[PDB]
Write an enzyme that holds these catalytic residues in place. Sequence first.
Site, PDB file in Angstrom:
ATOM      1  N   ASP A   1       0.292  -0.825  -0.135  1.00  9.30           N
ATOM      2  CA  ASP A   1      -0.193   0.198   0.267  1.00  9.30           C
ATOM      3  C   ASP A   1       0.760   1.200   0.062  1.00  9.30           C
ATOM      4  OD1 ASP A   1      -2.691   0.808  -0.039  1.00  9.30           O
ATOM      5  OD2 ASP A   1      -2.809   0.834   2.128  1.00  9.30           O
TER       6      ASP A   1
ATOM      7  N   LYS B   1      -6.638  12.009  -4.585  1.00 12.50           N
ATOM      8  CA  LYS B   1      -7.078  12.874  -5.537  1.00 12.50           C
ATOM      9  C   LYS B   1      -8.460  13.081  -6.702  1.00 12.50           C
ATOM     10  CE  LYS B   1      -6.061  16.163  -9.342  1.00 12.50           C
ATOM     11  NZ  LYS B   1      -7.526  16.196 -10.233  1.00 12.50           N
TER      12      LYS B   1
ATOM     13  N   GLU C   1      34.358  -6.965 -12.676  1.00 14.95           N
ATOM     14  CA  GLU C   1      35.686  -7.325 -12.495  1.00 14.95           C
ATOM     15  C   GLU C   1      37.288  -6.624 -11.922  1.00 14.95           C
ATOM     16  OE1 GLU C   1      35.514  -6.419 -17.803  1.00 14.95           O
ATOM     17  OE2 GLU C   1      37.077  -8.147 -16.660  1.00 14.95           O
TER      18      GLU C   1
ATOM     19  N   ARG D   1      40.456   6.738 -12.425  1.00 11.38           N
ATOM     20  CA  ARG D   1      39.935   5.787 -11.998  1.00 11.38           C
ATOM     21  C   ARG D   1      38.403   5.814 -11.879  1.00 11.38           C
ATOM     22  NH1 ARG D   1      42.771   0.633 -11.455  1.00 11.38           N
ATOM     23  NH2 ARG D   1      45.078   1.677 -11.264  1.00 11.38           N
TER      24      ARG D   1
HETATM   25  N1  ATP Z   1      -6.933  11.705 -12.063  1.00 13.86           N
HETATM   26  C1  ATP Z   1      -6.140  12.126 -12.965  1.00 13.86           C
HETATM   27  N2  ATP Z   1      -5.758  11.714 -13.849  1.00 13.86           N
HETATM   28  C2  ATP Z   1      -4.686  11.957 -14.940  1.00 13.86           C
HETATM   29  N3  ATP Z   1      -4.532  13.934 -15.187  1.00 13.86           N
HETATM   30  C3  ATP Z   1      -5.869  14.309 -14.120  1.00 13.86           C
HETATM   31  C4  ATP Z   1      -5.865  13.610 -13.518  1.00 13.86           C
HETATM   32  N4  ATP Z   1      -6.667  14.810 -12.127  1.00 13.86           N
HETATM   33  C5  ATP Z   1      -6.483  16.176 -12.887  1.00 13.86           C
HETATM   34  N5  ATP Z   1      -5.124  15.446 -14.023  1.00 13.86           N
HETATM   35  C6  ATP Z   1      -5.007  16.322 -14.950  1.00 13.86           C
HETATM   36  O1  ATP Z   1      -4.406  17.365 -15.040  1.00 13.86           O
HETATM   37  C7  ATP Z   1      -5.060  18.447 -15.662  1.00 13.86           C
HETATM   38  C8  ATP Z   1      -6.306  19.828 -15.545  1.00 13.86           C
HETATM   39  O2  ATP Z   1      -6.824  19.284 -14.540  1.00 13.86           O
HETATM   40  P1  ATP Z   1      -8.722  19.647 -14.147  1.00 13.86           P
HETATM   41  O3  ATP Z   1      -8.488  19.712 -15.762  1.00 13.86           O
HETATM   42  O4  ATP Z   1      -9.048  18.416 -13.601  1.00 13.86           O
HETATM   43  O5  ATP Z   1      -8.048  20.826 -13.279  1.00 13.86           O
HETATM   44  P2  ATP Z   1      -8.019  20.015 -12.254  1.00 13.86           P
HETATM   45  O6  ATP Z   1      -7.526  20.685 -10.857  1.00 13.86           O
HETATM   46  O7  ATP Z   1      -6.588  18.960 -11.497  1.00 13.86           O
HETATM   47  O8  ATP Z   1      -9.504  19.198 -11.161  1.00 13.86           O
HETATM   48  P3  ATP Z   1     -10.414  19.761 -10.165  1.00 13.86           P
HETATM   49  O9  ATP Z   1     -10.682  20.881  -9.610  1.00 13.86           O
HETATM   50  O10 ATP Z   1     -11.583  18.944 -10.120  1.00 13.86           O
HETATM   51  O11 ATP Z   1      -9.570  18.121  -8.853  1.00 13.86           O
HETATM   52  C9  ATP Z   1      -5.730  17.933 -16.865  1.00 13.86           C
HETATM   53  O12 ATP Z   1      -5.324  17.641 -17.913  1.00 13.86           O
HETATM   54  C10 ATP Z   1      -4.610  16.219 -16.651  1.00 13.86           C
HETATM   55  O13 ATP Z   1      -3.594  16.721 -16.701  1.00 13.86           O
END
Ligand code: ATP
Lengths: 170, 45, 884, 884
Positions: D281, D347, D751, D862
């Site tokens: 984890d 996230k 080596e 070295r």
């Molecule tokens: N779960 C995720 N997986 C992959 N990339 C992510 C993810 N969340 C955000 N991103 C990335 O961040 C960019 C901007 O995200 P977004 O447009 O959703 O704003 P945000 O602050 O991450 O979102 P929120 O306010 O809803 O948490 C995306 O286009 C992508 O590069």
Amino acid sequence: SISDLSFTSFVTNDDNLFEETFNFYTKLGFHATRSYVKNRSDFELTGISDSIKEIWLESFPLSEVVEAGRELRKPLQESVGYESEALLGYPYQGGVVIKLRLSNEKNNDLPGEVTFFTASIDKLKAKLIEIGAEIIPSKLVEFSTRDPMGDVISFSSYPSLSKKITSPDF
Amino acid sequence: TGISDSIKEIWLESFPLSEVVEAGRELRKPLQESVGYESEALLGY
Amino acid sequence: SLFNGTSFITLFAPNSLQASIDFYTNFLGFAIRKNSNQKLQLEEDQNNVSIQLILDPEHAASVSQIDQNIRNLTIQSNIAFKSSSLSKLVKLLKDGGHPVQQSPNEISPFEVYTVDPLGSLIGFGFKNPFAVNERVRKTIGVMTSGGDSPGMNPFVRAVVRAGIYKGCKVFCIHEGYEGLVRGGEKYIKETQWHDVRGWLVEGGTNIGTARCKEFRERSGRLKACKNMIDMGIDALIVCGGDGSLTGADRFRSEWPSLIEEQQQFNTHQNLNICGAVGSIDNDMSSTDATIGAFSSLDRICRAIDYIDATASHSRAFIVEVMGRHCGWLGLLAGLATSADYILIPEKPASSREWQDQMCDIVGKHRARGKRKTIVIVAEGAISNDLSPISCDQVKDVLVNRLGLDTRVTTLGHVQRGGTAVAFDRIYATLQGVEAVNAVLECDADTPSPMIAIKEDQITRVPLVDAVELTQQVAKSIESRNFKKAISLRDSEFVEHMKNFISTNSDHVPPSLPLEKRKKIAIINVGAPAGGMNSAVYSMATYCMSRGHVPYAIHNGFSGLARHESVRSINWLDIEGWGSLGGSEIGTNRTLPNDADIGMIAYFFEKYGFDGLILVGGFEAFISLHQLERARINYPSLRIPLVLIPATISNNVPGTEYSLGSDTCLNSFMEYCDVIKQSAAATNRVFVVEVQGGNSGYIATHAQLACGAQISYVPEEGISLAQLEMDINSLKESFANDQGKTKSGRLILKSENASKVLTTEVISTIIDDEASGRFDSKTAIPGHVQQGGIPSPMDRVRASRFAIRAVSFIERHSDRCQTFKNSISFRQTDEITSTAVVLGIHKQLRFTPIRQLYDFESDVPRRMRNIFWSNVREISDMLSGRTSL
Amino acid sequence: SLFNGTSFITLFAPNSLQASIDFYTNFLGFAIRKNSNQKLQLEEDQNNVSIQLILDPEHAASVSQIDQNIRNLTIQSNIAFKSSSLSKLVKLLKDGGHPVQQSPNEISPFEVYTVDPLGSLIGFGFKNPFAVNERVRKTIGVMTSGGDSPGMNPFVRAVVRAGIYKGCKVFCIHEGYEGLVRGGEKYIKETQWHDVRGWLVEGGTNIGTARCKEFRERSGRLKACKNMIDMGIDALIVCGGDGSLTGADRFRSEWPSLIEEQQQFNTHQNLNICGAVGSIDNDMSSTDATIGAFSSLDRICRAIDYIDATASHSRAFIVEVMGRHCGWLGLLAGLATSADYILIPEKPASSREWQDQMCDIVGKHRARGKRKTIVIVAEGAISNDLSPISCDQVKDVLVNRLGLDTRVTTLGHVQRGGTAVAFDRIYATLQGVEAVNAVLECDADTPSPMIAIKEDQITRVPLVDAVELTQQVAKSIESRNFKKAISLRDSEFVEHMKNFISTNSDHVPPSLPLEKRKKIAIINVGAPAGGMNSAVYSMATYCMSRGHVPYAIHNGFSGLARHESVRSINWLDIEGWGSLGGSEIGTNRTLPNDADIGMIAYFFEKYGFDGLILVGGFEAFISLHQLERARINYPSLRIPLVLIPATISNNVPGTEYSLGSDTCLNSFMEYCDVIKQSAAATNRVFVVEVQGGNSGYIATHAQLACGAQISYVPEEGISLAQLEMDINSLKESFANDQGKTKSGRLILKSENASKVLTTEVISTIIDDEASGRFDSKTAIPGHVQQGGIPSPMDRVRASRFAIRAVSFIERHSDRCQTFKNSISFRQTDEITSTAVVLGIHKQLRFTPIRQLYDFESDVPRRMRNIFWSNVREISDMLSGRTSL
Ligand SMILES: Nc1ncnc2c1ncn2[C@@H]1O[C@H](COP(=O)(O)OP(=O)(O)OP(=O)(O)O)[C@@H](O)[C@H]1O
Ligand SMILES: Nc1ncnc2c1ncn2[C@@H]1O[C@H](COP(=O)(O)OP(=O)(O)OP(=O)(O)O)[C@@H](O)[C@H]1O
């Protein structure tokens, strides 16, 4: 078997003349790529005929500018007509080496001149009126100018003079 | 040596006194085959 | 940018313009543009190079002329050009009468001047490796005459093979002139290529020699002439002594014996005759060394060496030496073995009785400490009044006038027996080759040649002139002008005579005035080499002779810098040094800059050395250059610096002969003989690993002297294609041994020839490919090839060179003291000439270190352009090797 | 001479003299002469050193004070002293508040100042290497709790051996808490050294884990306590998860259960307890990595790599990841495999629905060209309102909202199975060792520790504080403060979260204003290393995220100087680069000075680079220094220069971790396992030749990870005495195998450990010495150890470092442009700081190239002071090796 011209060298005894010449070409689009002064770390490739100070200025060749719409930046040699050679390939190719001799000894300047190519004849004319003097021409020469060194200006061995971004072939 | 730089430098030496060799001709310096010469890891005594 | 490119250079001429038009077109490759408006210089198509020329009075003739002369000091604004292979343009300008400026003369930017001065040329924008460079039939007869001389078989082997290769029948005339006068199949036998197998090792003459009484008269000379025309022999090659060749010369002038008693007289109208000196004496005048001379010298020294190898007071030893006419053997043995007194015909006692002379010299030597007195008595030992001096005569003087128990050693036939020494094998072979070519190249308008050696180089000299000159010497002896006789002998003889008496004479007042006496030092740098100790012995004894103070720098530059190893040289302490192997002083590979250069310089001034003699290989070569280049910093080094090359390798430029290479060559030649003999006992090859490093000199010469089938050299390397070809050669060689002599097979492989294809690897490939038809075994002796006791040649050459070195220091010391006592030393040409390399070239010359280091050497990790290319060609010819 | 020697230095003082008397006595070792005439400083007996001090007003206080301050500018007449080991005096002066002048700071002449200024000291007369330098008992109980975690066996192996070595009985508590509560010989077995044989390779837990319902209550906690006192167990070591350790922590506070129902209560009065996190984890808060986390991460990436290894439109792939509480596995897999969208609990989507968020991100990626969409679903995948998001939920969105044919991949038990990855083996082992020491060093006033890793370094952290902190994170998630929860996780987690979203986001407007946007270039210098391509991928995508222009210099410095290899980086072209082995850009060992430094400088100005990122080994290290030192000549180089070390060797100073070393370690570890397994099948040893050059890092770590008996390293070499001792060890080892597990035997030989005693030679010696009792065979894999597909750790670390590099260039570019646009550049301290090496130290820090090159490296042939000394000691302990 001489390909073209490598560079022009201008030697002076007066440091005040040397620095004022440096600042003159600096305003004209030159960039100091290499510098030297009298420290054992300094690399020596040119220094005779010795020299107390040396500034190597380069007015870089013109290449096919990249769009990204943001602001325009230089491309790579992924450019239009770039043909890679054994060394470097095949772009409007001008460097001028400024050399400074000691207090004493040194020959006087002879009468000859160099004619450089510009695809911006009026833009150059405007900087010269904004800076120094503009001599009237004789003979390909568009006009002429001076500093302790007198120089001429025109178009290269090709027919005309500023499309940096070229038309890709079919 | 050149600091502290220098435009010119002259290194003068008034050589040490060693046990002069006889040959009767004129007197010349010996070697370190001399009287009290004791060879060290570097140079001797 | 705005200064986008470079269109053209604009030049203004006074009123005249044409001088420059001719320069930029012939020198730079420019061209005048078609249909000029007034009375443009472009380079070529698909380019952008241009220079504009105008005749307007904008540049003055007075100013431009003054500026051109002003530049003749080795600053002004200039123009540089991008141009590939600057080296070619620099030569074209310099030879065209134009001065040029460059970086290491190897070279980076080139700069010349026209009526338009400072026209620069760069080989690239910034620092990096530069822009790549753009775009005849006649049947031969061989004979040997006079007493047995080692090297006669190698010579005949060479004549038989060379003549065969050049496509002509070779006949061996058995029993010399006797065989020639008697004639027939009984004495004139046709010889094949395989019939002269392993004759290199064989001593004496397999053909045979005989004194023909009949040939002394016109009676026999005519009978001999008939026998040649009957046998169809179109050319004669005589290998013998003085009279042996004078009789051939008389036979040459008497050849027009048309005798009516015309087909044969038309064809066999002219006598193609060639001579080669087959003598131990070294009496023949137009050659430096005769065939057998150095082997005979070797036999003598072998005995003297054994005599010296013992204890004891009241002991004298007499070495009775064979050699009736000349004193070369006596003089050289005396020199090589540092004998007390020599009795030779060219130098009899003059101002006092020989007994008084001998007793004085012997006495002085014993008095100073030398307990083992050696006296050499020549066969031609004579007094002023030409009375021959016997051994017993000499013995009684030593036994009765001095209290010495004298034991006589007489060589006799020993001096003619044994295998030829490496020098005799190499030289007799090449002489055999040359004799054939000379005989074939001969035309009726060309005077009959004799093959001669002149300072290690094979030449052709008129036989008449050589016969005449030898008689002139005999006349001088008989007319009692010994001083004249000495000068009439070769320049080496006169130098050796001078060298011997000077080295024999510390125990007599110095030959120079107090003012002209100096402090000369000697060092040994590199690995040991035979003659290092001889060069030291000869230099010290010669210094004492002049009144100089000889100093020895023990254990190279490391010993001096870290330990103050400056030591004096005592005559009694150096007793027998000329005959000792290695370096008594001590040698190492440490360079002046790897030791403290400042400390070397300090001790040079502390001891106030007036000159330096370096005896050693490539490290001593670099050492010279390092000491020469440090002269700007240290006035103490502004003295003559002389290098006497000493390496078994012969990798040092400046000489064609390095000290110790003959000692080494001979030890390896003796090793290879035993290995080939072993191969001859069992269908077997031997791959023999050779020393000499990156220098292929020793393997080249060992191949010639031993009869090796192949020699793999570092300059050529070993290709798989050549290896396969050479293995198939072996396959065929053994398939053709059915019937011929079993002489054995060798392949010599210089360790540096291949890092991958090693002696051991090569041999395993031979076995693999041989498919049980024969086997291969290696022979890896190792870095033992140096050898102990140096060869008489090495002992002798080292003496000669050490003296020439001291004499150079004498000459140049006065000039040096100007630079020594003065600061503001700008490193001129007068001073660079004093740092020199003593060497043999075709001529014995001193070459400034600057030209050999910068231009004649692989300064880098290789440490080495070869001269031995022809030797290589001949050894492949003689063994039937096919290259690629 | 006349100036025969130097008696003494005479110094005149103003009126006061004492300050100087104290200086020359304390600093130089002088002494005041007995019974002073007025109110002489001699050094020592049998010498000639003397300094005379007079109080006569001949030197002014105003003049002397002005001269001292005048010298504080880094010319005057002085006196130099002959003194050995100047280094010691320079430190003594500098630390004593006195400034000094020296040659290379290594050092040649030292010069300081008193009231009598310019007191020089030389280490010799002239240039040469200098004058030589003068003259406690308690029985341990181990248990594992929670789900199977790779590395649990290596940990137990470590605890059993460490405890045994420290002289105490080790008991293995089978079935964790269940075994502890039930007690008896049935569950609490005494474990021997040979009982944990080859457990490094073994997956899961050989002891076993069990969820104990009774231990959750005071009912069981008491029963467990009794069993420990009955078994005589004085200390407990728990290796498990969050609750597994919280339950141990509760048991610690509840330990005062004296319960009368006194000998035992007196002795077993305190609970010695130690924790180690055995979880996949990585949820525990006070450690950077838990045991099993990187092996689990590895299983996930192995699947994603196989998924990416194919063609195709309308395709989406779901990777269902195990990991209930944390999102570390999801985040790191997402980063290592450049996944489009990750669903992790820390996230969840906030400003819009997760479906809208996912579809937008996925959509943007497909639109720009990416055809293989990878979505990672965590076990703890959740929404804002804490609603768990399933795989099917995610599948339907991709299948119905987008037109994608979605195929789900679920790892399940795969994520707990298999052998522990090199990192888990090395770390679990060291943690086991530490857990024993911690348990022994424990005292009633010391709070119960938990073994933790903090930036590649083993530490002790209070278990209560770690238990409390993990609860705080869970509280933040449950209280819906995800932003807070993210910050509460380790600093690496917060950085990785930032790194991932920025690299995932070219397809959104730049994060910097136009003015703050730069031109950053990247090069690869040296041999390839895993993560070179990842560092490039991460740097380019991060540059696009900020609005920078990422440039790639193809084929190192040679490609730039000879061929103008500056190339742009397109997002679509770099697809899958983070997972690719070697160098896509092209790497070589060519140094900037071996390529044209002027040409590198020319192209740096032509393309106007605002910074440079070097990814590579020791050649890239030298490269930095060469580019830094050329700054005086070229203004174009006066920009931030950053090196991210990338070598399989780990020879670069500045970091403790070089990119590609984990990839390499793991490939060699997998190789050694197969070799040991083969040895186990046949009384045989294997001598395994190890790479890494002059660096012994890889063989050290491979010895620990594989259980090799010996590892021969270049820093120690191989002595004959150690070789004989080690062979006798093998002799005894096989004689004692009678009865124990046959796990096989390995000897790892770098080596470079010995040029003479090679893998093949060593093995033949073993056979000779073994006398038929066992045999030895070699294992020489070769320079293949590099490895393909880089380790998830390498992919992740390279991302982190590439971003820190870009961020440094952002910070320092403004300062540099002052030196760039100006001539008269005197090479200050503000500029030397910009040429730096990014590295791990205990802390992630940038170290100026100057201090690491001059002081921390064997600059010479070295190319390498080691840190791994402790790892070495432990691996010898665990294998029974006896050194000399
Ligand atoms: N779960 C995720 N997986 C992959 N990339 C992510 C993810 N969340 C955000 N991103 C990335 O961040 C960019 C901007 O995200 P977004 O447009 O959703 O704003 P945000 O602050 O991450 O979102 P929120 O306010 O809803 O948490 C995306 O286009 C992508 O590069
Ligand atoms: N035959 C010789 N062998 C060896 N050394 C000799 C011989 N003749 C002369 N020398 C060397 O020359 C030194 C001087 O010899 P000497 O005094 O007899 O004068 P010389 O000019 O050679 O004799 P002369 O005038 O009688 O021919 C000798 O003491 C000796 O060291």
